[PDB]
Amino acid sequence: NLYDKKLFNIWNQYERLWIHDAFPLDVSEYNNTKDFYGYECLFSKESIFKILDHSLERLGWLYFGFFTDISELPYQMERYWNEYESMNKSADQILWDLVLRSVIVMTIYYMPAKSILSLVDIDAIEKYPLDFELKKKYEIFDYCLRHTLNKVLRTIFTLPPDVRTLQIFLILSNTNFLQIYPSLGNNILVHCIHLAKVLGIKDFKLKINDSGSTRLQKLSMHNIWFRLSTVDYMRSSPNKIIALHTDNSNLEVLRWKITSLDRDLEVSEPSLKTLKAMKELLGLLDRKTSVSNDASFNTKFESFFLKLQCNFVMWKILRYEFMQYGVTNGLQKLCCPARRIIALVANFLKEDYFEYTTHPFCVHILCVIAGFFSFYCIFHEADEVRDLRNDAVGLLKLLFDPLRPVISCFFSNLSRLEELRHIWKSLVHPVMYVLKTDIIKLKRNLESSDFLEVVREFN
Amino acid sequence: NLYDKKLFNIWNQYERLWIHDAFPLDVSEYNNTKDFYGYECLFSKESIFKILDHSLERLGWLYFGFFTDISELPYQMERYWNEYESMNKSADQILWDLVLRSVIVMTIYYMPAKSILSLVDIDAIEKYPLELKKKYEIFDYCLRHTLNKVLRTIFTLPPDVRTLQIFLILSNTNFLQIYPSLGNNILVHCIHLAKVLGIKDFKLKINDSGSTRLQKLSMHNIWFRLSTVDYMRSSPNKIIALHTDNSSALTRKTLIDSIDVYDVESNLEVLRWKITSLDRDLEVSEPSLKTLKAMKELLGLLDRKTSVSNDASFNTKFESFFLKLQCNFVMWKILRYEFMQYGVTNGLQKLCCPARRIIALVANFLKEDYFEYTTHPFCVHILCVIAGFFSFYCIFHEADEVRDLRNDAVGLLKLLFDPLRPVISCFFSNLSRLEELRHIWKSLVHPVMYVLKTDIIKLKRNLESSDFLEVVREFN
Amino acid sequence: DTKLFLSLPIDIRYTVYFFLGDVVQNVRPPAKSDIFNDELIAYPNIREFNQSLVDKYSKHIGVYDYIPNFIPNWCRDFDLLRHDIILTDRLRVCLQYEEQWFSVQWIVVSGELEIGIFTTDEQFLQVSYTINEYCHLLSIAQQDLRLGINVSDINDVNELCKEIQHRWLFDTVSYISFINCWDLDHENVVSIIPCMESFNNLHMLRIESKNMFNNLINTQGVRENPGKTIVYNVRQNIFELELYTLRDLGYKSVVDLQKWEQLQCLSLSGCEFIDLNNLILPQHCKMLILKEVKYIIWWDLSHLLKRIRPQWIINGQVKKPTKKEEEEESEWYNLYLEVVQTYQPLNFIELHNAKRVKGNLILPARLVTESRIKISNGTKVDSVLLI
Amino acid sequence: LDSLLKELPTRTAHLYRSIWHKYTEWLKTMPDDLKLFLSQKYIVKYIASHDDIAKDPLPTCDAMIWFSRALDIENNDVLVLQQRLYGLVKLLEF
Amino acid sequence: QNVVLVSVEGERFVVDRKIAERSLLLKNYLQIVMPVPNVRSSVLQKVIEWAVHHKDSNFPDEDDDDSRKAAPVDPWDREFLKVDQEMLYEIILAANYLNIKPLLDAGCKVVAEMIRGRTPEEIRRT
């Protein structure tokens, strides 16, 4: 059982190295590669306005949280259209252009296939490369993304420091983007971090006799800075070492708090009163969570994501407990959080909100859950955990096109790990010795033992 | 005297705001901008080989400090020429392309006019947009082309060490004082790459082969040049930094990955970083007096170690020149601090002597036909601050010594410098403004110091017969 | 004269007072060796001898009281040394650079607090002044200061200082000294160990006896006495360190201080034997200061001296130029790295005259070319070589 | 010998010599040569007169011991004397 | 070899070159005539008188404080400096200007003797 605690720590590091897991070199292949945005090009401005309507209906959350005013956005949109029409420059206009493009791209990532397929032009499909479903949708999404990225890479360095770049990155983080083009994303993250510390956005310390505009400015600054620290913890592999989550110690605050509990879980001093206080505090925050009442799509979405974060972090905390200090009944008390998560994703399937399921955070979550569940399913027996893990993996294979390489890689190495069950099924065990070798293989990839090595070579 | 101390504090802030004193905002303008580099474009193969020969002759300093072997460079050069001819890709080839291009541009900035003008082709002048002005315009065109190429291939790339070299190879130019915000941003990216690769592992270990030693040596030189620039280029436009990760050479009394010094190596990159750290401890951290005594003793010792370098070739004179320049500059800053704050006697004359040494040096390097070596931006920063303070205390007090030294500095600087036209022009105009301020004060919370209070307030808000006094204020 | 002397700059006055280290009183007690000699110097002097100070301050003065007329001398000395503008600039300036000259700490007598300014060797008193007088002469602040424990200042007086800097005031003090009370007992430790919580300006300590050191510091003598030893949070907050006055530090001793972490400077004086091969240290501490002692035993460096060839040796210095001889070049670097790894957590070594070191000096050239290795003329060694 | 005299702190040693002086004078009060000086009888007579020293007799007795072993005295003598002296400090400290 | 020196009054005194290279400010300024601002004639005369009395002499260091406070007040110097206070202070300031330390140390030694061999009545005036 002490062996269990140690090998649970080993599984922690192995999951760490899990989570520490084409686009061209010279930005010149995409020098003249087609838009989607022109009058004759791909999408018909009015369809775009409809897209914006759908975005503002369901998903105000992100950009409502950031900006000050949002009629601003259709306003700027129509202004650019008029200006585009008049043209048949400056910094502001180009930023706003990129802003609306990224907004649209987010909307694309959270649209149904058939709809957009009805929107897109036809001879423009003949103009462009095909893939002809969701695969077509994701190929056109990828083309739009790469085009936007071409546009933004050039235009990032050559500019004064303005807030809106940050907005771009944040609008684009809610996608497959960072887990498919990681190093790119990390560098732009570093630049955005520099812009963050530039502007003194830690002056959201709200002061006296400030105007409502000023309150909204400081609120935007607050939400942005804290979302930035959120991502900067969640996306902090050894590829990046510069950070802002060290500078810490409205429910944006709440999400950052939850991230800080996860941080304190991972890196710092594990005590027991610490965990007791954290878990009470998180129940308190669940109270504060359920205070939100169902009244509209964005609200269901937000409360879903918050409850998801809360149960995920509770699952991590209670895991930490049962690995390090071995309290009893914790396996079942850990399985219950998973069931809550799964009731939530069930709600968001049954309500025809499967597109909302496609957030990468959910997939990271299911990844780690299925990971630990497979671990303790092969090392120990509990039909509950087995059943849940089977649900998770059948779900993830049958439902997810977007993150095709990662899930498939995970699935393939996961299927490899089922053969490792047979090994352990066929005591400093050779299986834990194999896992020592495996963590060593990964850490060095960063920069009947005969038969055991035989099956290793086979896989 | 207390008034002197206070206005000297004002001069501290005013020199910061002195030094806190086109590019298209869109790369696609250079989407189709031709080259200088094809066989027929501007610069023949042979001209380029000649450029590299002159570079290794005169200015080995930089890239000698960085790389391991340098016959590597002509080797890769000729290989790239062969591959270009065969093509009429990869990462290595494009990196090496950028490397040689930047090397060249540095060499252009440190070439004599007549030579390059003899090398360059002719009808390509008709192809392209069009003394020193021709040299600097063609240099600027080459620079902007290289910058387009390298921005693209910077972002879209894995993390490799050689990118860093590019920036360092290019920092020794007008670049950072002509394209500041750009430079600061790319500097942030290079800092990230530095901390990525663990180049703090120049901690030389046991039973390492010579290749490993040379790798760690290159890392070491890189790190210290990087810390040098990162302190030297640290306006409030930038707040992220790396000059904290090293540590002062001072051996303080009042006080891990934070690297210390004297424990590593002796290559004079270390010496430059030491000197910069002394300047740093002067500026930001606790100013004491025993501190200054120890610093001054240490700096005299290091001036000895500087002049130990003996004349045997151009690069050696260049390095020893820059080191003695830095040493006397820092001595001047220290002695300024002393004579400004606590009024120790004879420090003014012992301060004037360093300026005379500096000016004898630059006189030697003009008279020897080495004016190109003078063009390093640090020298110009130095003369800027010197002329600033000398004008300050020349208008507030009278000493024909000071008048002579300041007149020498400013006549020199005006008569000799086109390159950094924006910076020097801003400085010259505001300097003539301060000369009109001399006329004012010559014709006690004085209205003149009150006007300078107004000026610092104007600047601080630019971050994000009092009737006649305001009249002349509006006039200037 | 006075104002002529005060129309002058600071370096002049500094060197002058450096020659006048601390002799402000018109008298002086002896060392210990001069005690048993019955020769008393001379102090025949007379009145202006108030019975307000001889009775009060006797806890640090009445120890002696056995010579020609000394206390009236002392009394009028304390009287007249309240107006020496000489002394006021002495302190403004000595404070300006460094008060290695005057040791200046808190005191309480009659339940009345004052600030006393003493010698350094054992802090024989010279005078004292009130806080309000002191910072009317100067600027008031939490001006960091010193403190030490005597049989005069042990527990309740000490706890009186504690409760005063709680109730009336705030703990404006850093540095702690153990000058007497070598027993680890008679209430000094009992008082102070619960009292280092409001005590957060400091990094600095001073120690006296091998008994107190071995039974408090040298962490091999492990026990479970919680109030008898420190709380380890202060063991973090001790970047500096000082110690004196013992005979046999490391002769077959247990010299190791890994618990004494976040240390950054060591000072040692006034001893009679030492060996560095027993010595073990944390990281973070390279500043080593060492004062007049008897013969030192350097590191061994014997095997490494056997590794050497005269292939290269010149003038006490060495180098391989031959890149072709990686055999010799790698050997050179192996040698150099072994050398520094012996001294690994050290970069600065100061010696006053200790009269001898026995242990085959071979050092690096990077540091002796500078003034890192800073020996006085304790020039009784010959086995010198540099890298 | 002299090294043993050197072994001590400094304030304490100055105190010790001052007390040597004091006791020599209080013995000069009487007509009356080192154990007669440092005599249990004469010492307790001193202390009976010097109740002030009975308030801090710890270094008093320790110094008397230190002198009873300073010069050539049989070590058994000074330690049985020390047993008597610990009896005395127990008697008087309460 | 020899060098001229201008007392700021304007007086063109003369020294042997190397005997003046005893000094350090000179040893740097050269590396024949030199100015000497804010110095007077008898000042520099007595200065060079000491400098010539002390040419082949040995001096410990500018860091050995123990050898420094080891305080043999030289008797020739001791009688040689039996003068008033203002000329004295000017000598001292000149020594500070010239980086010639042992003379400055001796001056401070003597001034310390002045303010050590004192009287309370000097304070009773205060």
Side-chain angles (χ1 to χ4, degrees), chain C residues 257-268:
Chain C
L257 300 91
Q258 310 307 91
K259 315 194 178 156
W260 294 100
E261 54 162 13
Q262 283 191 353
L263 183 60
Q264 264 166 29
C265 166
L266 180 143
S267 289
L268 198 168

Side-chain angles (χ1 to χ4, degrees), chain C residues 55-104:
Chain C
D55 311 285
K56 184 171 198 216
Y57 298 68
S58 65
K59 277 58 172 169
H60 322 85
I61 293 148
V63 176
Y64 297 93
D65 212 325
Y66 75 117
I67 48 176
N69 294 319
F70 177 43
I71 320 309
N73 267 318
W74 200 103
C75 192
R76 205 169 183 182
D77 189 67
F78 196 105
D79 182 75
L80 287 151
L81 302 191
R82 290 188 158 283
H83 297 72
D84 267 342
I85 302 107
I86 309 105
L87 190 65
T88 67
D89 64 60
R90 209 158 146 79
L91 299 157
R92 275 198 312 290
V93 168
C94 191
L95 180 136
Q96 201 75 249
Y97 295 1
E98 183 69 8
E99 271 164 16
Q100 185 59 257
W101 291 249
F102 312 139
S103 302
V104 175

Side-chain angles (χ1 to χ4, degrees), chain A residues 25 27-28 31 154 158 197, chain B residues 25 28 31 90 152 156 239:
Chain A
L25 299 197
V27 172
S28 309
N31 259 332
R154 42 192 80 203
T158 59
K197 292 151 153 170
Chain B
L25 297 78
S28 297
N31 195 329
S90 198
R152 304 148 168 248
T156 59
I239 292 152

Side-chain angles (χ1 to χ4, degrees), chain B residues 206-334:
Chain B
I206 202 75
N207 61 45
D208 311 327
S209 168
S211 69
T212 303
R213 275 162 262 165
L214 296 151
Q215 183 171 124
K216 274 195 186 157
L217 177 62
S218 195
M219 282 180 172
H220 156 253
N221 310 126
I222 289 154
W223 167 268
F224 275 101
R225 189 75 53 69
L226 202 73
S227 313
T228 304
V229 295
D230 190 19
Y231 179 81
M232 277 311 317
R233 187 48 268 193
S234 309
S235 49
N237 196 311
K238 176 171 67 52
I239 292 152
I240 284 157
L242 184 52
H243 64 95
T244 69
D245 206 302
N246 293 266
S247 185
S248 61
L250 185 67
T251 52
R252 264 206 187 182
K253 214 210 186 182
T254 74
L255 306 166
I256 317 96
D257 58 340
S258 291
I259 285 165
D260 210 313
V261 203
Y262 308 91
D263 55 315
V264 299
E265 269 194 337
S266 48
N267 309 137
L268 56 88
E269 318 294 356
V270 167
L271 182 59
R272 280 194 277 281
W273 170 243
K274 275 186 241 185
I275 294 148
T276 289
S277 49
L278 297 165
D279 191 341
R280 163 182 140 205
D281 282 316
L282 203 163
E283 278 290 359
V284 305
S285 300
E286 177 205 289
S288 301
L289 288 164
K290 169 55 181 180
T291 290
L292 312 204
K293 210 170 282 191
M295 291 165 69
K296 180 161 66 176
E297 295 156 12
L298 176 137
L299 176 39
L301 179 61
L302 293 162
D303 265 315
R304 186 271 304 160
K305 175 157 277 168
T306 310
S307 200
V308 164
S309 54
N310 180 236
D311 54 353
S313 42
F314 301 95
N315 53 22
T316 309
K317 283 88 155 159
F318 183 41
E319 286 165 24
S320 290
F321 157 85
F322 199 66
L323 297 200
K324 271 149 182 200
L325 181 53
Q326 258 182 34
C327 283
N328 303 286
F329 172 53
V330 169
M331 278 295 299
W332 181 95
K333 274 186 97 182
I334 291 152

